[PDB]
């Protein structure tokens, strides 16, 4: 730790505080993720982030460089990336982001995600604040504090997962099981968000979250999602909204982008496209 000069706090995330710092010897700019250890010992979020990211070596997943246990603290040393997707979208809130850059970013995130999934890892917190962009045009998945190694087949996992705006309807309606599909839902929301530069479903409670989903995609029933009306938190008094046409919801999208977005935002987790199948979608025909 004597080798690092802290420059400034840059954010928080799932657990701990994150700092920009400079290696004094090599000159390398890094990100330090700090955990104070003061009761249960090392937090499960840290144990998980670390073990999993050591396996996940991929150009669209943020690189863990080192773990240092100093005097009462744990520091995770990560590559630094100069910008996150959220800030990048706020600075393009007027001109827009050109569709080929959106396509490239989406294609890269899907590569990172398919990697996690084929390596039995659920991220469970995909949102623009956790997607980091470097000066080269690369985008990368980050903050694996809420991630988890999953089995084949899955059991029941933690219920209180995924930031509200990016949270899948099967979690909100209280399914016993969830899996890789929750990450794809999140990415669907992000795909739409890059196009419009505003969050697709910005709810302020669980019920309000469902209502925002329903207003846009149509209120799910037994036609579209068999078993939905029997789910724990499904209520027969839910309003029945009709599904909106995607060319009003995300106008810049072409035919293929509408089809892909539809498949990522399917109600039924068994119909929702996988990350690897999405990489083969015709939308990625002409990807840079």
């Amino acid at each position: 730790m004597e080798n690092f000069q802290k420059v400034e706090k840059i954010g928080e995330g799932t657990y701990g505080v994150v700092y920009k710092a400079r290696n004094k010897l090599t000159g390398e700019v890094v990100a330090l993720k700090k955990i104070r250890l003061d009761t249960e010992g090392v937090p499960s979020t840290a144990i998980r982030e670390i073990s999993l990211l050591k396996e996940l070596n991929h150009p669209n997943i943020v690189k863990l460089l080192d773990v240092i246990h100093t005097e009462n603290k744990l520091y995770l040393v990560f590559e630094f990336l100069h910008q996150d997707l959220k800030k990048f979208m706020d600075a393009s809130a007027l001109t827009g982001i050109p569709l080929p850059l959106i396509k490239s970013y989406l294609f890269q995130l899907l590569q990172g995600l398919a990697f996690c999934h084929s390596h039995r890892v659920l991220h469970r917190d995909l949102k623009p604040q956790n997607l980091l962009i470097n000066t080269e045009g690369a985008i990368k998945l980050a903050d694996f504090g809420l991630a988890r190694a999953f089995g084949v087949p899955v059991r029941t996992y933690t219920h209180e997962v995924v930031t509200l705006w990016y949270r899948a309807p099967e979690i909100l309606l209280g399914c016993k099981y969830y899996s890789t599909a929750v990450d794809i839902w999140s990415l669907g929301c992000i795909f739409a968000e890059m196009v419009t530069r505003r969050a697709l479903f910005p709810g302020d409670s669980e019920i309000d979250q469902l209502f925002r989903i329903f207003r846009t995609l149509g209120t799910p029933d037994e036609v579209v999602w068999p078993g939905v009306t029997s789910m724990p938190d499904y209520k027969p008094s839910f309003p029945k909204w009709a599904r909106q046409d995607f060319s009003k919801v995300v106008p810049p999208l072409d035919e293929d982008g509408r089809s892909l977005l539809s498949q990522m935002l399917h109600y039924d987790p068994n119909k929702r496209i996988s990350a690897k199948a999405a990489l083969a979608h015709p939308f990625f025909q002409d990807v840079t």
Partner: protein
């Protein structure tokens, strides 16, 4: 089958070779024996039952102990501190609601303090280089269960029982990879209950024939036949429960004709 069932199987295959502990490590341990490890592991099965932990959590804890004792000498009076920290880490990795440190200290009857358990935790992490996501017998079995035609709950419980027996005895099971033990346990369970054999679709998926499984199977069959006489009995007592359909009371076949 779910989306990545084949990609995950192939990856778990690669990882199980990297996460394997030294086959002969107990020979190089000046003060502990296989018999002391068996007593430790059998106690952790009790701990698992008492705190209602998943079977995956127990299999991981054992993998951490074996990798930890492959590189560090340990005195007999500290062996249970190693096991306790290992179980704590496995629980934080795998469980939604891990028991707390204070509870892990309590189940050792205050042999160790809270501070010792948290320092042992740091040491175990450092020695294992934070690599906790190890393939287990359990992870292989549950994938193999997706190839039953049709599913048989007696087969599944018996195969879990045999898989878990193999954790107790370092000699001989440290000489086999988890995917091999799971194949042996699945075939033996299948044969005991229905008389069927390791199916064609699993030969295709795993690349293992019965022939490749045979040495482990010979070992596992002996473990099964002698299980009522074993000095350690927690696993056996646990698979008497109706939750596991009393499969530990079933009679093992006399021969496998292999």
């Amino acid at each position: 089958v779910p989306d990545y069932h084949e990609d995950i199987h192939t990856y778990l295959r690669e990882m199980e070779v990297k996460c394997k502990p030294k086959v002969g490590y107990m020979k190089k341990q000046p003060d502990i024996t296989n018999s002391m490890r068996a007593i430790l592991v059998d106690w952790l099965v009790e701990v698992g039952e008492e705190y209602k932990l998943q079977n995956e959590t127990l299999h991981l804890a054992v993998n951490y102990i074996d990798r930890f004792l492959s590189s560090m000498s340990v005195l007999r009076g500290k062996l249970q501190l190693v096991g306790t920290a290992a179980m704590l880490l496995a629980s934080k990795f795998e469980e939604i609601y891990p028991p707390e440190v204070a509870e892990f200290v309590y189940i050792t009857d205050d042999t160790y303090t809270k501070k010792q358990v948290l320092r042992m935790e740091h040491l175990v992490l450092k020695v294992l280089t934070f690599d906790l996501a190890a393939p287990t017998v359990n992870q292989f079995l549950t994938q193999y269960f997706l190839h039953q035609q049709p599913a048989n709950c007696k087969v599944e419980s018996l195969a879990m029982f045999l898989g878990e027996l193999s954790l107790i005895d370092a000699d001989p099971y440290l000489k086999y990879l988890p995917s091999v033990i799971a194949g042996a346990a699945f075939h033996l369970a299948l044969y005991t209950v229905t008389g069927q054999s390791w199916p064609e679709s699993l030969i295709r998926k795993t690349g293992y024939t019965l022939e490749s499984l045979k040495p482990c199977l010979m070992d596992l069959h002996q473990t099964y036949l002698k299980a009522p006489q074993h000095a350690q009995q927690s696993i056996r007592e646990k698979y008497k429960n109706s939750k596991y359909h009393g499969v530990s009371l079933l009679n093992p076949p006399e021969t496998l004709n292999l």
